[PDB]
Amino acid sequence: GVEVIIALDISNSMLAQDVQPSRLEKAKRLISRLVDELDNDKVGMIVFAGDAFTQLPITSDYISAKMFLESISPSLISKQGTAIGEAINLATRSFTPQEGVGRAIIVITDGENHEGGAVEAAKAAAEKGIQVSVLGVGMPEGAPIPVEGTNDYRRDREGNVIVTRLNEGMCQEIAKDGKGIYVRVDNSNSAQKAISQEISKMAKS
Amino acid sequence: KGVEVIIALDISNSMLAQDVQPSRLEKAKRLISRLVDELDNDKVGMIVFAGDAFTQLPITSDYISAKMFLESISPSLISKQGTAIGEAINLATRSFTPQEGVGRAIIVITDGENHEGGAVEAAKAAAEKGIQVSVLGVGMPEGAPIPVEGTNDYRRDREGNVIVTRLNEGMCQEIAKDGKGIYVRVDNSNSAQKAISQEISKMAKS
Ligand SMILES: [Cl-]
Ligand SMILES: [Cl-]
Ligand SMILES: [Cl-]
Ligand SMILES: [Cl-]
Ligand SMILES: [Cl-]
Ligand SMILES: [Cl-]
Ligand SMILES: [Cl-]
Ligand SMILES: [Cl-]
Ligand SMILES: [Cl-]
Ligand SMILES: [Mg+2]
Ligand SMILES: [Mg+2]
Predict the structure, then answer these.
(1) How far is Cα B93 from Cα B116, in angstroms, rounded to an integer?
(2) What whole-number distance in Å separates Cα of residue A52 and Cα of residue B180?
(3) N or C: lower Cβ tally within 10 Å for chain A?
(4) Strand-pair partners of A8
(5) Residue B39 CA to ligand 6 centre (angstroms)
(6) CATH number, domain containing residue A192
(7) Domain span at residue A7?
(8) Residue A134: which residues within 8 A CB-CB, separation 6 or more?
(9) Which residues of B touch A (CB under 8 A)?
(10) Residue A137: which of A166, A158, A162 has the closest Cα?
(11) What's the CA gap between B204 and A126, in Å, rounded?
(12) C-alpha closest to that of A118 among A64, A81, A143, A72
């Protein structure tokens, strides 16, 4: 039995629709399916934008895990930014006291505009027997972010349309130093299958 | 007291932006349809333009046909891209009846974006022939991306970057001023249509 903590980016950029139906909703589908492949394991979830917080404390209750998953939206966090380092640090503190267990942190993000700290956070996790993997959601080419109520798109401080890009290089550096894997999430089931197989390989270690 | 009205409609790719509902182009068509409903003893013609301009509807009192010619308008009518407002205005001035003593208007409907020059001179030359050139500016000055039909993607430049298109209010205003017509911004209300129909009515009565 292993412990998996998901660190899900819920910043505004995750509402981009360059993966269907959006980055965030694709990420929630993948998590749900990830949970379905778990056996006698425990799963927790952190959400982050400018801050990070524990959305789901580490649990074997998969029915509740899916209900908590389905209620996630960017409105859970008002402060904006991409605080991957804080999320990883929170996750490392969020595992159970048991020794001898395989432990994974799965960061699901577009990796965009992270100031600094994720790489070190991932390094610190790795040296505590935790493997940090990153699932990169979005495309490097860039997409605008639709606004639900209106017919407009998200705008920066100056009032210009925001184009958000997947930053794969950032995602890759985190995963390398966190001793996990990186995979790009696209419309297929490829990312979910790749991370699920990394989980169950860790389980048989 | 009949007048002659020629509409010069921008059908370049930027008119597929959806910052006015349902799009800049489709909003323009709906406005034109209502403009035609307000005509009485009048004639109407239509030109579409992007990189080139052509006559979509020769000047006519047949409003039923005018509306069905409107429906067939889309950007695929012209493949060459650009914003050839001057060419459209110049074509419009050649398209009116020869008859002297008749009020005549050219109504340019566009986001006025990336015009290379000529429009203001063209509008001035129309004005010197007694034709009043008005401009209905569609879109947001603050910019919008251009969705691609059927997909969840957006039009991209050569380098792969999302295109953002803005209404250029300044350019639209210069054209209307020198053309001796009015400038009005098109938004989601019926305000632009009523302003222009008012201008047309005012012309017919003077
Ligand atoms: Cl999936
Ligand atoms: Cl951070
Ligand atoms: Cl970093
Ligand atoms: Cl912009
Ligand atoms: Cl274009
Ligand atoms: Cl209207
Ligand atoms: Cl021109
Ligand atoms: Cl000009
Ligand atoms: Cl861009
Ligand atoms: Mg973001
Ligand atoms: Mg254009």
Answers:
(1) 20
(2) 59
(3) C
(4) A47, A108
(5) 15
(6) 3.40.50.410
(7) 1-205
(8) A106, A107, A108, A109, A111, A171, A172, A174, A175, A178, A180, A181, A182, A183
(9) 18-19, 21, 140, 142-145, 152-154, 156, 160-162, 164
(10) A166
(11) 81
(12) A81
